[model samples]
Target: STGSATTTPIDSLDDAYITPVQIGTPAQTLNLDFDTGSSDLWVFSSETTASEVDGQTIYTPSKSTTAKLLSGATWSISYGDGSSSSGDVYTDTVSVGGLTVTGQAVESAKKVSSSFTEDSTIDGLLGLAFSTLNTVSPTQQKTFFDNAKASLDSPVFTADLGYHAPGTYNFGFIDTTAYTGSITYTAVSTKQGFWEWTSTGYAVGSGTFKSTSIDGIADTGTTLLYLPATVVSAYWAQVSGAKSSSSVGGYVFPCSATLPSFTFGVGSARIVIPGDYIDFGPISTGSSSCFGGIQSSAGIGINIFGDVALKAAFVVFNGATTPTLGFASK
Candidate 1:
């Protein structure tokens, strides 16, 4: 069997991509951010504090016949920056792009911080990372893909993220037509419950390729690309007006600057991110200074090959008994 879903960037800056997921009986659909960086399928729900609810959609489990409370089950997840959301759990029929899973654990938020409430584009997140990262307790819950893999034709999924355009998430089978050229496969270290891997290093523009071993995670949930400080500085050095700004929170440059493309090595294959994609967009609306999509991972502890990198290639999150990742040109 196979299933697929279309994801669209919620904002002009490609802040995040969201797909509609149907939960419960009669199918209550809500837009959810499909994240490959975490492992918790949580949602804004009727139990959410009124003050925290904005224009976002909420899951009314009471309206779903198949909904059942998961007694004593609760969950809390905090982002890297410290903002958090905590909630209780429920078992319900959750379906994504026709891939149905019964008894799926759906965490219903009781309270959410302004970071979430202020963004009305997403009702929740559908975590695609390893199930080992699931935060649900008494017993950790299996992720949707983990539960559905057994029924799929193949235990694999792919993310074809687009820049300012729509992309596809396919389950069970890979769509050969979705990408061009042969895929470059890499070993994935799921030790931290993320799609972590190592790259053969990077190049600034059309410059010489640097052959350093760069460890990072292919995180769809993250917006910007974060690399080692040395690598980041090397990339920015090529741009005349680019500078690291403490006030702006990252490296910034003139919006009119002629940016250069960035290339990273996956195995022996080189994937290039266009210069325009690096522009990111202005630091503020109509501002003359623009933010670079790529930043330093100094404080992050680990490099994150976020949307900025993922959008440049077709990525396969192969979840076989022995997990691996596949990258291809498009």
Candidate 2:
């Protein structure tokens, strides 16, 4: 009736959570990043150049009897990191956490930019964003959630993201036992296929809450929190040694310096991310410089409460009604 999975963090808290997924008839398994930001179930496959497929597992549909190629169908997706992938489309059985979707669109990678080809830790992206953003041309395809949602007892999934550890992604129902305190729910306005909402206000550490409204998305695929340049400047003004480094890319701060907690107000609930989490560990080992997890969402324009901010609490991506996102202390 339902399916779910536990996600593990990659190195240095800079990437996203990776989970196991099964594709094709023979059940070829792959480690995929369950991204809440984008929509397209794409993976590295035999279609990729041999040299580019090094350190990665390629999905070969020829090995599966149930695989069917959708003639003239193709999909391409590009991420904020500038990584892009494009490939042919195939209809295959795809499953996650033991729950199966009989005819899911499995985008097989034929071309990938170095941003994706270099990273062996992530083989594919299991897009959990709304299917309206699916990249398939000629005809759009549905995601695993889109297909399995009808059979679920309750159409809901919870993101229990942890710091430097593993967390669970629950499907069909929320595991109340995983979080402490009460779950605070907010109505999400999903425009552009993203789980987005407006933050009524935000506070810098112990400072008074500034009555500033910000439109943003809850994106799991992004590792850092992103806000407008003006907002980012406000937060950086409080950090003693913080500087916007073009060479370093993004803002960096002193490792030994104590940072401030950033809080976002949503329907009376203050989702506060501690300063330590905002530090994002070290930029390079053996160095006292650290990158700020919260950066300017300018140029990009869309603020994203990436993994760094979401990890501060338990997040429930509720799709049952208007796609609400509930938050609570973990």
Candidate 3:
């Protein structure tokens, strides 16, 4: 089901090369990740050590007179990669571009790492994927959209990402310049915090493969797409002269050939994955075989359409109107 149309240009803040909105009255920036897999906004803070917080941009409450700390609450989040950090809670008035949001919740990091600390690029992560995955509690929760909704001409927000490129990440507003005349809307499932849909099938060149009828979830948190093993292997088979080399993780192919263009169909919508996405290079894995967009995830419940897949489409998230997600201009 489609909702009303409201377009706004997302902004870029700090050196992070992306724009994020603050949640409270005094307004401090929270780095946002346009993740379709999970919904959460986390940030680094003053408590974080200089060493751990080295490269990362830390939001100093002292810097902003409007900032307020949530004295009782402290948090630490860990990723699958063993990277983790801890911080206290704070609130501030956050703004993106000309848009100002109030009562935004933020986490101040007490501990961080060199890997996470070095850059001033991004201050924190704003998760736009699903509400179920929101890390903030209702009692203390505040989202960029939640605060900006009433202020915005339209209550909904749209994300346009350049993905892998230096620019192209926009929030708050939609760029009409990128809008195509036609748009398609997909109903959101209330199952989990993921923006998911079922794939009818996949195709490469002129060939089509029957889809395993697997439900695919779009996730911005993950860097690569994860598909079923059978489907992934089948795709490489279709690639001309494709072979498995022992230098790459899943599969790798010589970067010389014009990689086959692949498309995935979801109901009436067909999402195309460019050839550059298929080419995999030597990594931790020894075999550099024909790299398929599909990777092995053991028992991962659903297919994950990561950044590589999401960059090709213009996605909209509407919590104001029945909490649905819409896809257009794929």
Candidate 4:
């Protein structure tokens, strides 16, 4: 059977979207970010120390009759930004939308880093990457999606991300009604645990699309779109007041800068990222300044097509062989 759920964007922080899932027998509901960049299903739970729990909701396995400890199995994960969480493991019934997994391994966090502690509202993370990336020790754990795929009507999932609005995450089915136009399908290389592909090239508003191929991942967990330093320069230079803020250390511009749209090449399809999304949000400098949502990927070899770029289209993460990426204009 197919299942689906709505995704809520946090306040003005459209960087990530949260989806609710039911876990344990009593069905404890939790809001979790579905991350494509990492593979580890961890949550703030009874295993976490009270002081470490802070204001976040903790999943109390003791409250569920179906919860059982997976002896000797443990997990630990650190993000590219340094956020991390680690803990013991449990096999419980986890359900999303209406799809259910009978003995899914769920990691319960006993310790979390400052970055995760600060985001007290987020209860946990649901890793959507390949199971090979799962941090579970001894034996790799499968994701809820992977565990539930065989029973699903279709083995596909789609992400419809919106700005400051509720979008959706579809499981077991593809909602053709959710997007406009035909989906352009392209092959991807999931060598790393990501939905990545080599772009035919990109173009800065009205500029000619280049011919080189840049490999990047479609990561919904990340906020900014990251590309090569040269590509970042080509686009930001078109803005009149754009400059790299020494303090913030990224591209920043006047809030009113008339920015141009950034277009990416996906096989024969061109996915265009509007300028509005490019203006991430106001810079913290407290001036009428805005930081570019697109930054340089020089420091990180893997370019990121974060929410800033993915929000422009309906994306499909196909797990089938020679895995493919399906993009449809929204």
lDDT against the true structure, per candidate, is 0.93, 0.87, 0.58, 0.87
Query: For every candidate structure, what is the RMSD over all alpha carbons to the true structure, in angstroms?
Result: 0.8, 1.5, 5.3, 1.2
User: Model 2, residue 80: displacement in angstroms?
Assistant: 1.8
- Tens digit of per-residue lDDT, candidate 2, span 1-330: 777788888676647788889998788999999999988999999888777786887799999888999999999888888889998999999988878889899999999898787788888999988999999999999877878888887888788888878988878888889988888888787778999988888899999988878889988899999998988898988999899999888999998889999998777878888887887767788889988988999888689989988888898888885688888887
Off by over 4 Å in 3: 1-17, 20-32, 80-82, 113-115, 118-121, 136-140, 163-176, 209-212, 240-248, 280-293
Candidate 1 C-alpha lDDT tens digits along 69-153: 9999999999765668989999999888888999999999999989899999999999999999999988999999999999999
Identify the candidate with maximal TM-score: 1
For model 4, residues 284-310, the per-residue Cα lDDT tens digits are 746788889889998888899889888
Error of 3 at 142 (Å): 3.4
- Score every model by TM-score: 0.99, 0.96, 0.79, 0.97
Best by lDDT: 1
What 10-residue stretch in candidate 3 is worst by lDDT? Answer: 7-16
- The lowest-lDDT stretch of 10 consecutive residues in candidate 4 is 279-288
Q: lDDT at 17 for candidate 1?
A: 96
Q: If candidate 1 were superposed on the true structure by all CA atoms, what would the RMSD be?
A: 0.8
- The TM-score between candidate 1 and the true structure equals 0.99
In terms of lDDT, the poorest run of 10 residues in model 1 is 78-87
Better of 1 and 3 by TM-score: 1
